[PDB]
Amino acid sequence: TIALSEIVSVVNTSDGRLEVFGVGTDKAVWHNRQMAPHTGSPWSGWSSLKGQVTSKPVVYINTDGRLEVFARGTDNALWHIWQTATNAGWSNWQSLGGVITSNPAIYANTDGRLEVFARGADNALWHISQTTAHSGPWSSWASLNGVITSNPTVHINSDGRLEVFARGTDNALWHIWQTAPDSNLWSSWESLNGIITSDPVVIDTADGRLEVFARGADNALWHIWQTISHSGPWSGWQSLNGVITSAPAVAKNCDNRLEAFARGTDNALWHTWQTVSHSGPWSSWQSLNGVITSAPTAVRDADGRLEVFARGTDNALWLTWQTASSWSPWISLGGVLIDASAIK
Amino acid sequence: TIALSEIVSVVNTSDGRLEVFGVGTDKAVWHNRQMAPHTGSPWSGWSSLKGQVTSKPVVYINTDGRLEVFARGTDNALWHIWQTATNAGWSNWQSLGGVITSNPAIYANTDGRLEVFARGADNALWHISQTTAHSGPWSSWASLNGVITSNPTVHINSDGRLEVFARGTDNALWHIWQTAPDSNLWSSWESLNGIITSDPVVIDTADGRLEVFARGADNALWHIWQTISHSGPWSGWQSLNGVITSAPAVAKNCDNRLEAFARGTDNALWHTWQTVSHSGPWSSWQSLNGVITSAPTAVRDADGRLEVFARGTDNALWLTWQTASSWSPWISLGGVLIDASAIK
Ligand SMILES: COC[C@H]1O[C@@H](O)[C@H](O)[C@@H](OC)[C@@H]1O
Ligand SMILES: COC[C@H]1O[C@@H](O)[C@H](O)[C@@H](OC)[C@@H]1O
Ligand SMILES: COC[C@H]1O[C@@H](O)[C@H](O)[C@@H](OC)[C@@H]1O
Ligand SMILES: COC[C@H]1O[C@@H](O)[C@H](O)[C@@H](OC)[C@@H]1O
Ligand SMILES: COC[C@H]1O[C@@H](O)[C@H](O)[C@@H](OC)[C@@H]1O
Ligand SMILES: COC[C@H]1O[C@@H](O)[C@H](O)[C@@H](OC)[C@@H]1O
Ligand SMILES: [Cl-]
Ligand SMILES: [Cl-]
Ligand code: NA
Ligand code: NA
Ligand code: NA
Ligand code: NA
């Protein structure tokens, strides 16, 4: 099992609007977007992209600005749907085949080719990629092996090498990396040790280091980071304390200070942030209230403010954001969302 | 002729350090970099990359994080030098041949291939590109025609199409764009009218629109923007007032508010900024003091603060940056820099 998942995928679009993707009771993918590129913009409301999915739907932005959404289908294949033009209309759902047993994880190679990572029936990590920048057709499926028990997460190093993170059968954090940008050549799997009870979250720091956050065996938030830009050795695990009842979400303030969000024991949203600078010590955990039934999802908007989404007790998506002094009261974006995570 | 040029090229590197490139009295390219990814970091001091150049040296970051510097040689060919590894050592200077009559202008295509633009002996716009992502070999040279009387500037649209801007023989702003990302297919040249007396500066707004700044016939700062994301029609010219005696420089605050810098009639650095938000009205012009002998060069650092470089009366490079309340007093980074601009 893993800590309670994020309920939506969010992106800050090429025209600076937040757009959220979730799963309805009907197992279709629904999306909601800001009208305007500003904190507190009015929202479209929920509209259906249809499909029938059995994973979290995961949006990624192509290097040409076109959104593309990846999800496991009811047939256990990887499916996708994409904008035919930047912030315009959508394709039909198309199958990329395979059989997958996790949420997909996506990143652009330095050459503009999306690469998708997902667990297989064998609990190994599999991958498939665009054969040309921001376009089909796609490569054959292949395996990067391992034995994983969490959803995988991918990020790019500051030298353009993709790196993937996942929990192992021993409940340690494991990782594997490209040996060169855009490559089909990967490292061996390596253990970063620890005992983790959530999906891992990966972010690039202002100084080009990967930093991974995960819930610990004690339900505290832990983190570990590359000690040199795009390189090991890693720091070894450090606790950020708290007692959290969901997966964490992490985003960068516009001054690059990291901020972590998670559900607390009182079912409120809690957060901890770097103080002073992106090199600064972490704050005490503080409450942002709400009563939430999912992990929070955090994103920086076009005004450089953090916005956080979470499911409420009514199964609506609710939203709070940074103000000059504080955070805004929770508002409802409505909808009825399910946790469709392929791993729970 | 054109307004007095920027003296350096600056980048925020893949490990969040500012690195500045200039030309010495010896016509070699010199560089200076922050030790640490923070406002007020100590600097390396000036070190030589050698070469013998007759343009502003222009640094660009490859999609794999490797810096690459482009300059016209004393032989009037395009030359370049690149990091062999991300924030590591440098190649030898290599010729990309051709004959050019402007500073080079560089952007990455969505597929990771750098494309370089420079004026020819015929005063047409010429271009050359990497044949593969972040690597040689390079394409043949070819012309995009036109007749230009300023250094060209290139930016990518929010839909991944490169667009180039330059002053025409009629002193209007002209532009030309790719018809598709990564394409060799371009539009016809189109006039945006106006009368401009500086190189144009181009920036992408938070909402995915190109906005161009240039000095006017009245030595005021003017600007014009795409009215729709990655699309015409354009806004038509609007004055931001001031009386400026250098080219302008523009950067984005970490909340995406645009800020323009230029030398004033008193030879001090002056600036004007968007107030409230990236959609907000522009401030009155205010002084940041100094006595400068170049256009300013503006960049946002890893702490989300603007830093501005300018040549002093002693021909040293000086530096001021945003503080909580104000701006820091000018400090000297030393060196002896010349304006090597291929167009003055
Ligand atoms: C990232 O996991 C950190 C874990 O490190 C382990 O070595 C500790 O025994 C354990 O403490 C209960 C932590 O959860
Ligand atoms: C973020 O959740 C907002 C919640 O606010 C709570 O105070 C309400 O009782 C409850 O009302 C349905 C909401 O779910
Ligand atoms: C994201 O919300 C989608 C839901 O919208 C609701 O308004 C519908 O009643 C419901 O259809 C049964 C959908 O699941
Ligand atoms: C961008 O140039 C704006 C120019 O627009 C011209 O139409 C004006 O006559 C002229 O006013 C003196 C401005 O410099
Ligand atoms: C940015 O320029 C700083 C200048 O400050 C001036 O106040 C000094 O007189 C002068 O001293 C050499 C410097 O060039
Ligand atoms: C960027 O500064 C480079 C200059 O460094 C100076 O210290 C040297 O005297 C001078 O060599 C004649 C260089 O041009
Ligand atoms: Cl668990
Ligand atoms: Cl002039
Ligand atoms: Na954006
Ligand atoms: Na905060
Ligand atoms: Na950077
Ligand atoms: Na300012």
Short mmCIF file of N, CA, C and O in Angstrom, two decimals, chain B residues 195-301:
data_model
loop_
_atom_site.label_atom_id
_atom_site.label_comp_id
_atom_site.label_asym_id
_atom_site.label_seq_id
_atom_site.Cartn_x
_atom_site.Cartn_y
_atom_site.Cartn_z
N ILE B 195 9.28 53.74 -36.08
CA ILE B 195 10.63 54.28 -36.41
C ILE B 195 11.50 53.96 -35.20
O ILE B 195 11.20 54.51 -34.12
N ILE B 196 12.50 53.09 -35.33
CA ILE B 196 13.29 52.65 -34.15
C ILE B 196 14.76 53.00 -34.33
O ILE B 196 15.27 52.93 -35.47
N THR B 197 15.39 53.39 -33.22
CA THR B 197 16.76 53.96 -33.15
C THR B 197 17.61 53.11 -32.20
O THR B 197 18.67 53.58 -31.77
N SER B 198 17.16 51.88 -31.91
CA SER B 198 17.95 50.87 -31.16
C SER B 198 17.72 49.50 -31.79
O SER B 198 16.72 49.32 -32.53
N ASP B 199 18.61 48.57 -31.47
CA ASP B 199 18.31 47.12 -31.60
C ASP B 199 16.98 46.87 -30.90
O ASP B 199 16.67 47.49 -29.88
N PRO B 200 16.15 45.95 -31.44
CA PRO B 200 14.94 45.51 -30.74
C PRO B 200 15.30 44.47 -29.66
O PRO B 200 16.25 43.74 -29.83
N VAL B 201 14.54 44.47 -28.56
CA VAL B 201 14.61 43.44 -27.48
C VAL B 201 13.29 42.68 -27.50
O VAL B 201 12.23 43.33 -27.53
N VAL B 202 13.34 41.34 -27.48
CA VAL B 202 12.12 40.49 -27.52
C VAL B 202 12.07 39.64 -26.25
O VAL B 202 13.11 39.11 -25.85
N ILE B 203 10.88 39.53 -25.66
CA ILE B 203 10.63 38.68 -24.47
C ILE B 203 9.28 37.98 -24.67
O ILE B 203 8.43 38.53 -25.40
N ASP B 204 9.13 36.79 -24.10
CA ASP B 204 7.84 36.07 -24.01
C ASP B 204 7.17 36.50 -22.70
O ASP B 204 7.85 36.47 -21.66
N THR B 205 5.91 36.92 -22.75
CA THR B 205 5.13 37.28 -21.53
C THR B 205 4.71 35.99 -20.81
O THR B 205 4.79 34.91 -21.42
N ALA B 206 4.22 36.12 -19.58
CA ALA B 206 3.69 34.98 -18.80
C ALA B 206 2.56 34.29 -19.57
O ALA B 206 2.37 33.06 -19.37
N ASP B 207 1.83 35.02 -20.42
CA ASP B 207 0.66 34.46 -21.16
C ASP B 207 1.03 34.12 -22.61
O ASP B 207 0.10 34.05 -23.45
N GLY B 208 2.31 33.90 -22.90
CA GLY B 208 2.76 33.26 -24.15
C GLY B 208 2.69 34.18 -25.36
O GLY B 208 2.54 33.66 -26.49
N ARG B 209 2.83 35.49 -25.15
CA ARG B 209 2.84 36.50 -26.25
C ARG B 209 4.25 37.07 -26.38
O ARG B 209 4.90 37.32 -25.35
N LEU B 210 4.72 37.26 -27.62
CA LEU B 210 5.97 38.00 -27.88
C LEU B 210 5.68 39.49 -27.72
O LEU B 210 4.59 39.94 -28.17
N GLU B 211 6.58 40.19 -27.04
CA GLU B 211 6.55 41.66 -26.81
C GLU B 211 7.93 42.20 -27.16
O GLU B 211 8.94 41.63 -26.71
N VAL B 212 7.98 43.23 -28.00
CA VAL B 212 9.24 43.81 -28.53
C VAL B 212 9.37 45.23 -27.98
O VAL B 212 8.35 45.95 -27.97
N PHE B 213 10.55 45.56 -27.48
CA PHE B 213 10.91 46.91 -26.96
C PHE B 213 12.00 47.49 -27.87
O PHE B 213 12.92 46.77 -28.29
N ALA B 214 11.92 48.79 -28.14
CA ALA B 214 12.95 49.49 -28.93
C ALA B 214 12.91 50.99 -28.62
O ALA B 214 11.84 51.48 -28.23
N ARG B 215 14.04 51.67 -28.75
CA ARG B 215 14.09 53.15 -28.67
C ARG B 215 13.39 53.72 -29.90
O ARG B 215 13.57 53.16 -30.99
N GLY B 216 12.64 54.81 -29.72
CA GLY B 216 11.91 55.50 -30.80
C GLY B 216 12.71 56.66 -31.36
O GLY B 216 13.76 57.00 -30.77
N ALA B 217 12.21 57.28 -32.43
CA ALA B 217 12.82 58.47 -33.08
C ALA B 217 12.92 59.62 -32.08
O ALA B 217 13.83 60.46 -32.25
N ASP B 218 12.05 59.65 -31.06
CA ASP B 218 12.02 60.67 -29.98
C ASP B 218 12.90 60.25 -28.78
O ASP B 218 12.88 60.97 -27.77
N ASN B 219 13.63 59.13 -28.88
CA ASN B 219 14.51 58.59 -27.80
C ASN B 219 13.69 58.21 -26.55
O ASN B 219 14.31 58.02 -25.48
N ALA B 220 12.37 58.07 -26.69
CA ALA B 220 11.50 57.37 -25.71
C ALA B 220 11.65 55.86 -25.91
O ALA B 220 12.13 55.44 -26.98
N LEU B 221 11.28 55.07 -24.90
CA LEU B 221 11.15 53.59 -25.03
C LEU B 221 9.75 53.27 -25.53
O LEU B 221 8.78 53.72 -24.90
N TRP B 222 9.65 52.52 -26.63
CA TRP B 222 8.37 52.03 -27.20
C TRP B 222 8.32 50.51 -27.09
O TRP B 222 9.40 49.88 -27.00
N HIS B 223 7.11 49.95 -27.11
CA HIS B 223 6.87 48.49 -27.13
C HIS B 223 5.60 48.16 -27.91
O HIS B 223 4.75 49.06 -28.13
N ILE B 224 5.53 46.92 -28.38
CA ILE B 224 4.46 46.37 -29.25
C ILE B 224 4.41 44.87 -28.95
O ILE B 224 5.47 44.31 -28.59
N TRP B 225 3.24 44.25 -29.03
CA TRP B 225 3.07 42.84 -28.60
C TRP B 225 2.03 42.13 -29.47
O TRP B 225 1.12 42.80 -30.00
N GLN B 226 2.18 40.81 -29.61
CA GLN B 226 1.14 39.90 -30.14
C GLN B 226 -0.12 40.08 -29.28
O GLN B 226 0.03 40.13 -28.05
N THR B 227 -1.31 40.20 -29.88
CA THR B 227 -2.57 40.45 -29.13
C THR B 227 -3.17 39.12 -28.65
O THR B 227 -3.92 39.13 -27.66
N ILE B 228 -2.85 38.03 -29.34
CA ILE B 228 -3.29 36.64 -29.04
C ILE B 228 -2.02 35.83 -28.83
O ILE B 228 -1.01 36.16 -29.47
N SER B 229 -2.05 34.80 -27.97
CA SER B 229 -0.87 33.94 -27.69
C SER B 229 -0.33 33.37 -29.01
O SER B 229 -1.13 32.88 -29.82
N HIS B 230 0.98 33.49 -29.24
CA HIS B 230 1.74 33.01 -30.43
C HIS B 230 1.08 33.42 -31.75
O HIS B 230 1.24 32.68 -32.74
N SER B 231 0.40 34.58 -31.80
CA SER B 231 -0.35 35.01 -33.01
C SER B 231 -0.42 36.53 -33.15
O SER B 231 -0.45 37.24 -32.13
N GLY B 232 -0.48 37.00 -34.40
CA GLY B 232 -1.02 38.33 -34.75
C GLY B 232 -2.54 38.35 -34.61
O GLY B 232 -3.15 37.32 -34.32
N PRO B 233 -3.20 39.52 -34.78
CA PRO B 233 -2.51 40.76 -35.17
C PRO B 233 -1.73 41.31 -33.97
O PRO B 233 -1.98 40.90 -32.85
N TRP B 234 -0.80 42.23 -34.23
CA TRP B 234 -0.01 42.90 -33.16
C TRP B 234 -0.77 44.12 -32.66
O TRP B 234 -1.72 44.56 -33.34
N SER B 235 -0.37 44.62 -31.49
CA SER B 235 -1.08 45.64 -30.68
C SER B 235 -1.03 47.01 -31.36
O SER B 235 -1.88 47.85 -31.03
N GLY B 236 -0.02 47.27 -32.18
CA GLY B 236 0.36 48.65 -32.52
C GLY B 236 1.19 49.26 -31.40
O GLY B 236 1.03 48.85 -30.23
N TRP B 237 2.05 50.21 -31.75
CA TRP B 237 3.13 50.74 -30.89
C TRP B 237 2.53 51.57 -29.74
O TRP B 237 1.56 52.32 -29.99
N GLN B 238 3.07 51.39 -28.53
CA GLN B 238 2.72 52.20 -27.32
C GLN B 238 4.01 52.73 -26.70
O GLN B 238 4.95 51.93 -26.54
N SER B 239 4.05 54.02 -26.35
CA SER B 239 5.21 54.66 -25.69
C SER B 239 5.20 54.35 -24.19
O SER B 239 4.13 54.47 -23.56
N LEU B 240 6.37 54.01 -23.64
CA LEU B 240 6.64 53.92 -22.18
C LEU B 240 7.42 55.16 -21.74
O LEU B 240 7.89 55.18 -20.59
N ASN B 241 7.54 56.17 -22.61
CA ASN B 241 8.12 57.49 -22.26
C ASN B 241 9.61 57.32 -21.95
O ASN B 241 10.23 56.40 -22.52
N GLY B 242 10.15 58.19 -21.08
CA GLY B 242 11.59 58.32 -20.81
C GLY B 242 12.34 58.98 -21.95
O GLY B 242 11.75 59.16 -23.04
N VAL B 243 13.58 59.38 -21.69
CA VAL B 243 14.58 59.80 -22.71
C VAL B 243 15.83 58.97 -22.43
O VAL B 243 16.44 59.14 -21.37
N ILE B 244 16.14 58.02 -23.32
CA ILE B 244 17.18 57.00 -23.07
C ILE B 244 18.30 57.17 -24.09
O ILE B 244 18.00 57.52 -25.25
N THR B 245 19.53 56.98 -23.64
CA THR B 245 20.79 57.21 -24.40
C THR B 245 21.53 55.88 -24.60
O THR B 245 22.72 55.92 -24.94
N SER B 246 20.84 54.76 -24.40
CA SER B 246 21.34 53.39 -24.70
C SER B 246 20.19 52.54 -25.23
O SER B 246 19.02 52.98 -25.12
N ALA B 247 20.52 51.38 -25.78
CA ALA B 247 19.54 50.29 -26.01
C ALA B 247 18.86 49.98 -24.68
O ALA B 247 19.46 50.15 -23.62
N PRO B 248 17.60 49.50 -24.71
CA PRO B 248 16.94 48.99 -23.52
C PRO B 248 17.35 47.53 -23.26
O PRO B 248 17.81 46.86 -24.18
N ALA B 249 17.20 47.10 -22.02
CA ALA B 249 17.24 45.68 -21.61
C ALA B 249 15.97 45.40 -20.82
O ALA B 249 15.50 46.31 -20.09
N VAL B 250 15.40 44.21 -20.98
CA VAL B 250 14.12 43.85 -20.30
C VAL B 250 14.30 42.47 -19.68
O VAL B 250 14.96 41.63 -20.29
N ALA B 251 13.76 42.29 -18.48
CA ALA B 251 13.74 41.00 -17.77
C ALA B 251 12.41 40.86 -17.03
O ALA B 251 11.68 41.86 -16.92
N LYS B 252 12.09 39.64 -16.61
CA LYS B 252 10.86 39.33 -15.85
C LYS B 252 11.22 39.18 -14.38
O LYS B 252 12.19 38.45 -14.08
N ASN B 253 10.50 39.89 -13.52
CA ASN B 253 10.50 39.66 -12.05
C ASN B 253 10.03 38.22 -11.82
O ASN B 253 9.57 37.58 -12.79
N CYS B 254 10.20 37.68 -10.63
CA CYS B 254 9.83 36.25 -10.39
C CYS B 254 8.30 36.10 -10.42
O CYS B 254 7.85 35.00 -10.74
N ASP B 255 7.53 37.18 -10.21
CA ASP B 255 6.05 37.20 -10.40
C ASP B 255 5.68 37.53 -11.85
O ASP B 255 4.49 37.80 -12.11
N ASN B 256 6.65 37.53 -12.77
CA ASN B 256 6.47 37.71 -14.24
C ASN B 256 6.22 39.17 -14.63
O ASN B 256 6.05 39.40 -15.84
N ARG B 257 6.19 40.12 -13.69
CA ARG B 257 6.11 41.58 -14.03
C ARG B 257 7.35 41.96 -14.85
O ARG B 257 8.49 41.68 -14.40
N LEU B 258 7.15 42.55 -16.03
CA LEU B 258 8.25 42.99 -16.92
C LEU B 258 8.91 44.23 -16.31
O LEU B 258 8.22 45.01 -15.63
N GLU B 259 10.22 44.37 -16.51
CA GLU B 259 11.00 45.53 -16.03
C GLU B 259 11.99 45.92 -17.13
O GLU B 259 12.73 45.04 -17.60
N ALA B 260 11.95 47.19 -17.55
CA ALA B 260 12.82 47.75 -18.60
C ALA B 260 13.90 48.63 -17.95
O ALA B 260 13.58 49.35 -16.98
N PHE B 261 15.12 48.53 -18.46
CA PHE B 261 16.32 49.28 -18.02
C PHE B 261 16.92 49.98 -19.24
O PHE B 261 16.90 49.40 -20.35
N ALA B 262 17.46 51.17 -19.04
CA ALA B 262 18.17 51.93 -20.09
C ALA B 262 19.01 53.04 -19.45
O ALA B 262 18.69 53.45 -18.31
N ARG B 263 20.06 53.48 -20.14
CA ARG B 263 20.82 54.68 -19.72
C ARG B 263 19.94 55.91 -19.94
O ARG B 263 19.24 55.96 -20.98
N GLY B 264 19.98 56.85 -18.99
CA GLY B 264 19.28 58.15 -19.08
C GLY B 264 20.22 59.25 -19.54
O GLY B 264 21.43 58.98 -19.71
N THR B 265 19.70 60.46 -19.74
CA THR B 265 20.46 61.63 -20.24
C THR B 265 21.57 62.00 -19.25
O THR B 265 22.62 62.46 -19.72
N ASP B 266 21.37 61.76 -17.94
CA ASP B 266 22.38 61.99 -16.87
C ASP B 266 23.39 60.83 -16.79
O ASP B 266 24.23 60.85 -15.87
N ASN B 267 23.34 59.87 -17.73
CA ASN B 267 24.24 58.69 -17.83
C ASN B 267 24.06 57.74 -16.63
O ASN B 267 24.91 56.84 -16.47
N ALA B 268 23.00 57.90 -15.85
CA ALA B 268 22.64 56.94 -14.77
C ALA B 268 21.82 55.80 -15.39
O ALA B 268 21.30 55.97 -16.51
N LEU B 269 21.74 54.67 -14.69
CA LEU B 269 20.78 53.59 -15.02
C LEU B 269 19.38 54.03 -14.59
O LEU B 269 19.23 54.40 -13.41
N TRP B 270 18.41 53.98 -15.50
CA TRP B 270 16.97 54.21 -15.20
C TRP B 270 16.16 52.93 -15.47
O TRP B 270 16.60 52.12 -16.31
N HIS B 271 15.02 52.78 -14.81
CA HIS B 271 14.13 51.61 -15.01
C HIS B 271 12.66 51.99 -14.86
O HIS B 271 12.35 52.98 -14.18
N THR B 272 11.79 51.22 -15.52
CA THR B 272 10.32 51.27 -15.44
C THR B 272 9.82 49.82 -15.38
O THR B 272 10.44 48.97 -16.06
N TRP B 273 8.80 49.55 -14.57
CA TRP B 273 8.29 48.17 -14.33
C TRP B 273 6.77 48.14 -14.40
O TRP B 273 6.12 49.16 -14.07
N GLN B 274 6.23 46.99 -14.79
CA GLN B 274 4.79 46.69 -14.60
C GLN B 274 4.51 46.71 -13.10
O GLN B 274 5.32 46.15 -12.34
N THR B 275 3.42 47.35 -12.68
CA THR B 275 2.96 47.38 -11.27
C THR B 275 1.87 46.33 -11.09
O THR B 275 1.13 46.08 -12.06
N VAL B 276 1.80 45.73 -9.90
CA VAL B 276 0.69 44.86 -9.42
C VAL B 276 0.85 43.45 -10.01
O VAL B 276 0.99 42.50 -9.22
N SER B 277 0.79 43.31 -11.34
CA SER B 277 0.86 41.99 -12.02
C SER B 277 1.45 42.13 -13.42
O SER B 277 1.65 43.27 -13.89
N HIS B 278 1.67 40.99 -14.07
CA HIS B 278 2.17 40.90 -15.46
C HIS B 278 1.15 41.51 -16.44
O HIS B 278 1.51 41.69 -17.60
N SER B 279 -0.07 41.82 -15.98
CA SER B 279 -1.12 42.52 -16.77
C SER B 279 -1.21 44.00 -16.37
O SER B 279 -2.08 44.70 -16.92
N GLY B 280 -0.35 44.46 -15.47
CA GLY B 280 -0.50 45.76 -14.79
C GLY B 280 0.06 46.93 -15.60
O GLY B 280 0.82 46.73 -16.55
N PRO B 281 -0.31 48.17 -15.23
CA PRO B 281 0.24 49.36 -15.88
C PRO B 281 1.70 49.61 -15.47
O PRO B 281 2.11 49.20 -14.39
N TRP B 282 2.45 50.31 -16.32
CA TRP B 282 3.89 50.58 -16.13
C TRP B 282 4.11 51.76 -15.18
O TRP B 282 3.32 52.73 -15.24
N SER B 283 5.14 51.67 -14.34
CA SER B 283 5.57 52.70 -13.37
C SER B 283 6.13 53.91 -14.11
O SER B 283 6.42 53.80 -15.32
N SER B 284 6.31 55.03 -13.40
CA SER B 284 7.19 56.15 -13.83
C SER B 284 8.63 55.63 -13.89
O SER B 284 8.94 54.67 -13.15
N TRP B 285 9.47 56.23 -14.73
CA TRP B 285 10.93 55.95 -14.77
C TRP B 285 11.57 56.44 -13.47
O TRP B 285 11.26 57.59 -13.06
N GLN B 286 12.44 55.63 -12.88
CA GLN B 286 13.17 55.98 -11.63
C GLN B 286 14.65 55.63 -11.81
O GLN B 286 14.95 54.74 -12.63
N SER B 287 15.52 56.33 -11.08
CA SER B 287 17.00 56.22 -11.22
C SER B 287 17.53 55.14 -10.28
O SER B 287 17.05 55.04 -9.14
N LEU B 288 18.51 54.38 -10.76
CA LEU B 288 19.30 53.41 -9.96
C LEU B 288 20.75 53.90 -9.88
O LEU B 288 21.62 53.12 -9.43
N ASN B 289 20.98 55.15 -10.29
CA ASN B 289 22.28 55.86 -10.17
C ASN B 289 23.32 55.18 -11.07
O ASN B 289 22.92 54.66 -12.14
N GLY B 290 24.58 55.19 -10.65
CA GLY B 290 25.73 54.79 -11.47
C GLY B 290 26.06 55.84 -12.51
O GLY B 290 25.25 56.77 -12.71
N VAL B 291 27.24 55.72 -13.11
CA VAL B 291 27.67 56.46 -14.33
C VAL B 291 28.15 55.40 -15.31
O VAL B 291 29.22 54.81 -15.07
N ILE B 292 27.35 55.13 -16.35
CA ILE B 292 27.56 53.93 -17.20
C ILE B 292 27.86 54.37 -18.64
O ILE B 292 27.35 55.43 -19.07
N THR B 293 28.68 53.56 -19.31
CA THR B 293 29.24 53.79 -20.67
C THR B 293 28.81 52.64 -21.58
O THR B 293 29.52 52.37 -22.57
N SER B 294 27.69 52.00 -21.25
CA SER B 294 27.06 50.93 -22.06
C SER B 294 25.57 50.89 -21.76
O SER B 294 25.13 51.51 -20.77
N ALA B 295 24.81 50.16 -22.57
CA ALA B 295 23.44 49.75 -22.20
C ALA B 295 23.57 48.81 -21.00
O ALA B 295 24.60 48.16 -20.83
N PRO B 296 22.54 48.74 -20.14
CA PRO B 296 22.51 47.76 -19.06
C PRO B 296 22.16 46.37 -19.61
O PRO B 296 21.57 46.29 -20.67
N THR B 297 22.54 45.32 -18.88
CA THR B 297 22.17 43.91 -19.17
C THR B 297 21.46 43.38 -17.92
O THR B 297 22.09 43.42 -16.86
N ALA B 298 20.21 42.93 -18.05
CA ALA B 298 19.35 42.54 -16.91
C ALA B 298 19.09 41.03 -16.95
O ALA B 298 18.92 40.47 -18.05
N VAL B 299 19.07 40.39 -15.79
CA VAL B 299 18.84 38.93 -15.68
C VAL B 299 18.26 38.65 -14.30
O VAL B 299 18.62 39.36 -13.35
N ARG B 300 17.38 37.65 -14.21
CA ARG B 300 16.84 37.17 -12.92
C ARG B 300 17.72 36.03 -12.42
O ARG B 300 17.95 35.07 -13.18
N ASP B 301 18.17 36.14 -11.17
CA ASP B 301 19.10 35.17 -10.54
C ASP B 301 18.28 34.03 -9.91
O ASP B 301 17.03 34.04 -10.03
#
